[PDB]
Design a protein around this ligand. Structure first.
Ligand SMILES: Nc1ncnc2c1ncn2[C@@H]1O[C@H](COP(=O)(O)OP(=O)(O)O)[C@@H](O)[C@H]1O
Ligand code: ALF
Ligand SMILES: [Mg+2]
Ligand SMILES: [Zn+2]
Lengths: 662, 180
């Protein structure tokens, strides 16, 4: 029953006949159906005229691949065409070009296509006819969509050089909120819309102007509700005087109060400086106080227990690493820490003392679910993964939650160095369970703000989140249910509600501006569009030359040193790379220098100081330990400067690969 | 003035500690009840599993006043045959069966539950509430006092058993009576 509602057909009218264009409708008005219907017409008409016609659907988040695959494309075209849903996780058994050569409707993630296009056999953009691009507002400065569209745009200008051609496939892109690039001018807003349009090579925004009231009947504005809180507990201040004593021992000036982002930034940078000097007795202290700071930050966000466990785990493994070498400022720390931590665990265990935010959260959950009486799905959006997982535990523990029938689970993306990484198969079944309804409360992160189509979402909740305007429009859109309630929770300490306010005004700017561009004069539209097209290309070329000149290298010039100690580790010639991917050292005396340690299939490298260096790896039948450039210090031979790099790509050195004859 | 016309059938009330729930707490000469996260030990027999309490008084006319801390609470009266165990995940029984009459107040709107059925009634701002019950006419009505007297809703029925007030509460919610 591919029967569109009136406004849908109305805004689809220009699309039915060429005219690569854009469609934007407010969230929850089934744009996917417009895509499906347009696709059917395109393929059928091309079949009537008998030309090779295909269509590729690009999505930017893995979960949506399976959703859009089995929810809107399978059920409507099981008899008419060959639709295949492919993502980077599914184990292919056939090359991408043959995958496309077999089917005709593809649903894939954009990174796959771009990979397949820079492999010049690969594939050419011309092989396609219709390019459906969902959630294309991400078309911005060097994003995955921008690369693909820049190839398309380059070819178009080449065609214009030819005219004074090769067909360029028709383009469609779906948005809900193009947004502004942080603009307090009407000019910058409308400019920004134009920049998106040109980079999409669109023709007309084409947003509804006829069937307004029925639209007002379909979409529902959720009810906004504010939960803002602002109890004294020594634990915060207990950590305070401990860490102030720590800072005063080395008599550091904070330049700001503790527990703040500037303080953390200062701590990291000064720790880098101290390591540059080679200053021990300070470096370690700086790192430890930093650890306290992040512990406090988690502490304010979540319950006491996990924050303590984080610190306890760090110091436990710290002394574990230290005692390995057995087989002055160091002990200066644990001695006081361990008495204090025993006391803290005594203080932390007391559940009567509680965070302010968590309190209001409990109030909100109970109020909403009890008022709903077993007809309620709620989505809570957070910031950090461990926040999601700990909040899941917090739901688990207090039995007062379960009595109300709330069933909770945590959903995060794949891939760290923590409790446990959740894998793709698990989240796939998790969303399956959520749709069924015996998982009643879902705790999610950034991963699932764009595209979820659960027909029952009475509750959408934001937990201390700060973000741009699109990440708020979409969040309000998720409540795809009647009497939908959108709740913001935060404490007045930070800039949260003010971010909400500015986001609101920015939203209104965006609507008015898109109405403004909606009514421009076609020739001026064309001129401005063309000029913008040019601008992107020339700037890309300039960046290209800048980068290639920036790349500028003796593979022996440098030598590596510890940070905790400064003992020379090895020279430039000792390092070899596996598959351009992993640096490693084979030197046998260098094997004697370090220490292995296990808790194991892989061993961790430990210095004489106790600092880690690398991990044991086995490759092509060889046994061999690798190293991380973060763990070391670079020393040149022309200039004796002490430098560090978080990753390997910064270092301009190039290494020989692996003589495997050894 | 109508409140004055009422108060000659005003009746004073007090709870029963046996029927109080675990997390619940009684105070002020058993005329005030408060809810806490901490449990008051195990519940045990004679206590309503779901978050309700019933007062020591029942009526074989009658008026009384009630003040409440905040919304998201329920006030009502049932036959002495109200269930005490639990079968549904939702933590309220009143109004589900025809043996009780309920009225739940929320920040949005009013809902009067009986026999599992309820309708939306325009919400109110105040917390102090009043109610009339006539055994002769079998009529139960609910009133609001602040700032003015609102005849919220009337219930018609025939009662063959004495009626006992039962109150449904939320965590961090406190409920108090009045006396004269
Ligand atoms: N013609 C229609 N008849 C019934 N429901 C429709 C129709 N068009 C759209 N919908 C609704 O739209 C929903 C799909 O919306 P979707 O496209 O996933 O949201 P968005 O447009 O925000 O991406 C379906 O669940 C369906 O209920
Ligand atoms: F409008 Al959508 F996913 F396309 F919420
Ligand atoms: Mg969508
Ligand atoms: Zn060292």
């Amino acid at each position: 029953e591919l029967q569109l509602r009136p406004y849908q057909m109305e805004v689809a009218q220009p699309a039915l006949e060429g005219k690569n264009i854009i469609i934007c409708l407010p969230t929850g008005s089934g744009k996917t159906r417009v895509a499906v219907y347009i696709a059917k017409d395109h393929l059928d008409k091309k079949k009537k005229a008998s030309e090779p016609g295909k269509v590729i659907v690009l999505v930017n988040k893995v979960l949506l691949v399976e959703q859009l695959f089995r929810k809107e494309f399978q059920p409507f075209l099981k008899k008419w065409y060959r639709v295949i849903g492919l993502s980077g996780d599914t184990q292919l058994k056939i090359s991408f070009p043959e995958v496309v050569k077999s089917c005709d409707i593809i649903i894939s993630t954009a990174q796959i296509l771009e990979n397949s296009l820079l492999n010049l056999a690969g594939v050419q953009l011309s092989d396609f006819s219709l390019i459906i691009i969902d959630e294309c507002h991400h078309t911005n400065k060097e994003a995955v969509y921008n690369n693909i569209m820049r190839h398309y745009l380059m070819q178009k200008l080449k065609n214009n050089r030819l005219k004074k051609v090769i067909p360029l496939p028709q383009i469609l892109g779906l948005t809900a909120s193009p947004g502004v690039g942080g603009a307090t001018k009407q000019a910058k807003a409308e400019e920004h819309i134009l920049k998106l349009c040109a980079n999409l090579d669109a023709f007309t925004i084409k947003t509804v102007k006829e069937n307004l009231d029925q639209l007002k009947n379909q979409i529902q504005e959720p009810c906004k509700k504010f939960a803002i809180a602002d109890r004294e507990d020594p634990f915060k201040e207990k950590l305070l005087e401990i860490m102030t004593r720590i800072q005063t021992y080395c008599q550091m000036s904070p330049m700001s109060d503790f527990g703040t982002q500037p303080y953390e930034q200062w701590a990291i940078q000064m720790e880098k400086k101290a390591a540059k000097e080679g200053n021990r007795k300070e470096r370690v202290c700086a790192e430890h106080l930093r650890k306290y700071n992040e512990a406090l930050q988690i502490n304010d966000t979540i319950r006491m227990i996990d924050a303590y466990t984080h610190l306890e785990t760090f110091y436990n493994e710290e002394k574990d690493k230290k005692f390995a070498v057995i087989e002055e400022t160091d002990r200066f720390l644990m001695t006081l820490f361990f008495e204090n931590n025993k006391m803290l665990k005594r203080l932390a265990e007391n559940p009567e003392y509680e965070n302010e935010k968590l309190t209001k959260l409990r109030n909100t959950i109970m109020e909403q679910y009890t008022r709903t009486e077993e007809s309620a799905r709620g989505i809570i959006f957070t910031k950090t993964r461990q926040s999601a997982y700990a909040l899941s535990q917090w739901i688990t523990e207090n039995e007062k939650f379960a009595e109300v029938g709330v069933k909770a689970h945590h959903l995060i993306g794949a891939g760290s160095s923590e409790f446990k990484p959740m894998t793709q198969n698990e989240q796939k079944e998790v969303i399956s369970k959520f749709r069924t309804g015996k998982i009643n409360l879902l705790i999610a992160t950034t991963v699932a703000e764009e595209g979820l189509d659960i027909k029952e979402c009475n509750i959408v909740i934001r937990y201390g989140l700060v973000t741009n305007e699109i990440a708020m429009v979409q969040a309000r859109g998720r409540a795809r249910a009647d009497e939908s309630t959108y709740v913001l929770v935060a404490h007045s300490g930070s800039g949260v509600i003010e971010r909400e306010t500015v986001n609101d005004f920015r939203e209104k700017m965006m609507y008015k501006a898109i109405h403004c561009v909606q009514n421009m004069k076609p020739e001026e539209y064309a001129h401005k569009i063309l000029e913008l097209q040019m601008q992107s290309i020339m700037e890309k070329k300039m960046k290209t030359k800048r980068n290639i000149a920036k790349h500028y290298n003796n593979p022996s010039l440098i030598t590596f040193l510890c940070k905790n100690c400064s003992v020379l580790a090895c020279s430039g010639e000792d390092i070899h790379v596996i598959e351009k991917m992993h640096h490693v050292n084979m030197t046998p005396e260098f094997k004697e220098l370090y220490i292995v340690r296990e808790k194991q299939i892989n061993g961790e490298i430990i210095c004489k100081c106790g600092q880690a260096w690398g991990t044991m790896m086995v490759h092509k039948g060889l046994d061999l330990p690798c190293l991380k450039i973060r763990n070391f210090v670079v020393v040149f031979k022309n200039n004796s400067t002490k430098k560090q790099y978080k990753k390997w790509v910064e270092l301009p050195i190039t290494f020989p690969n692996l003589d495997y004859s050894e | 003035p109508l409140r004055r016309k009422l108060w000659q059938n005003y009746r004073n009330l007090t709870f029963d500690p046996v029927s109080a729930n675990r997390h619940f707490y009684l105070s002020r000469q058993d005329q005030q009840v408060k809810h806490l996260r901490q449990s008051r030990g195990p519940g045990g027999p004679g206590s309503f599993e779901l978050w309700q309490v019933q007062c020591a008084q029942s009526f074989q006319h009658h008026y009384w006043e009630v003040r409440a801390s905040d919304h998201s609470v329920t006030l009502g009266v049932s036959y002495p045959q109200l269930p005490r165990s639990r079968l549904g995940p939702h933590t309220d029984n009143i109004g589900r069966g025809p043996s009780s009459w309920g009225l739940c107040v929320q920040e949005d709107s009013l809902q009067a539950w009986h026999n599992g059925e309820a309708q939306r009634l325009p919400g109110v701002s105040g917390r102090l509430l009043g109610m009339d019950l006539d055994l002769a006419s079998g009529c139960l009505t609910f009133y609001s006092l602040e700032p003015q007297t609102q005849p919220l809703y009337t219930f018609h029925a025939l009662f063959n058993q004495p009626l006992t007030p039962v109150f449904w509460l939320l965590e961090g919610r406190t409920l108090t009576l009045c006396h004269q």
